[PDB]
Structure formats: C-alpha cells, structure tokens
Amino acid sequence: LSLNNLQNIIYNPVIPFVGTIPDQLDPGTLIVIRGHVPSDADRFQVDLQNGSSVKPRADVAFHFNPRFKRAGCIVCNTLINEKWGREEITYDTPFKREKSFEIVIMVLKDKFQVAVNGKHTLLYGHRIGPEKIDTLGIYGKVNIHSIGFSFS
Ligand SMILES: CO[C@@H]1O[C@H](CO)[C@H](O)[C@H](OC(=O)CC(=O)OCc2ccccc2)[C@H]1O
Ligand SMILES: [Cl-]
C-alpha cells in the first residue's frame, strides 16, 4: 500500500485481470473502476475474491456481472465451494456497448453500495465476511482504463 495513494492506481490492465488488493476492505473503502464496453460485448464481470485459485475456483464474495443481451441487466451473486448462490438481478442497468463507465463500489458494514457514472445502481448484502476478500478479478468483454482504491 503506497503512501501516495495515487501510486495504488492500476492503469490499463490486461483483461482477464487478477490482482491482490493492497489493504483490507474495511467499511468506508472505495474501489473505483473506469473502463469502456467494447463493440459486440456479451458480458463482463468484477469479482471480489478470497484468493486466486483457478481450479478449484476461488470463492467470490461479490460477483458483479453486467450482461448486454436484449434490454440488458446486472447479475450479482456469491460463489462458495464452486457453487453459485441465488442471483440478485438488477434490470435498471446503465451499461451499454460502446459507452464509457465509472464504477464506484463502496464497502459498508452490511453491504456493498455500487454507483455507476455518479448514480446509485444497486446494493448487495454481504454473504461472506468482506475481511476475507484479498483479490480483484475482471473477466469477459471490457476494456479497463484504471482501478483505484480509497481506504479509510
Ligand atoms: C448460470 O450462469 C452462471 O451465472 C453465474 C452467476 O449467477 C455466473 O455468472 C456464471 O459465469 C461464471 O461462472 C463466471 C465466469 O464468466 O467465469 C470466468 C472465470 C473466472 C475465474 C475462474 C474461472 C472462470 C454463469 O455461467
Ligand atoms: Cl488508489
């Protein structure tokens, strides 16, 4: 965790991206993801993970998954011991092919609060303790300009 917090920003990561989060996600922590949905994207996802194991797959405390089929949606879920739980689906989605976005994930004591382009998008209640999250995963069809962290 750099003293100059601007030095913790990750620029132009290759997708698929996996990175260690530089400190624990305590209440008040922000994760800021700037990017662009490329032409013909089907879906992309941001995963807050407990480790980087590929097989068996690392637990995912928070799966945030924009999908571009038909009217579009966002699917949120949690992965434990390689099995998905019950999906929470948001149909009021701000994501579109060939549009830029800024995602802000705010870690609260009880939930994640997600805003896109400065507007509230969704809430996701913690299912796994957020103190187990150490890894950020970005997968699918997206271009990421930058990843930043604001720790309390
Ligand atoms: C019933 O459909 C499933 O809904 C789940 C959420 O409810 C996930 O969205 C899942 O996609 C995935 O399993 C996530 C994915 O695209 O995998 C990429 C990946 C990342 C890390 C390890 C292995 C695969 C999708 O197939
Ligand atoms: Cl940062």
What whole-number distance in Å separates Cα of residue 150 and Cα of residue 131?
A: 16
Angle at 151 between CA 147 and CA 152, to 5 degrees: 160
Q: Which residue puts its alpha carbon closest to atom 15 of ligand 1? A: 139
Query: Given the CA of residue 87, which atom of ligand 1 is nearest to it?
Result: 7
What whole-number distance in Å separates Cα of residue 152 and Cα of residue 24?
A: 10
What whole-number distance in Å separates Cα of residue 145 and Cα of residue 14?
A: 10
DSSP state letters, 73-141 = EEEEEEEETTEE---EEE------TT-EEEEEEEE-SSEEEEEETTEEEEEEE-SS-GGG--EEEEEES
Q: Domain segments of the chain: what residues? A: 1-152
Find out whether 87 is annotated in a ligand binding site.
yes
| Ligand nearest to the CA of residue 88, numbered in listed order | 1
Place of tokens 């922590």: 29
What whole-number distance in Å separates Cα of residue 147 and Cα of residue 152?
A: 17
Distances (CA, A) of 63 to 1, 5, 47, 98, 152: 24, 26, 5, 22, 23
Resolved by: X-ray
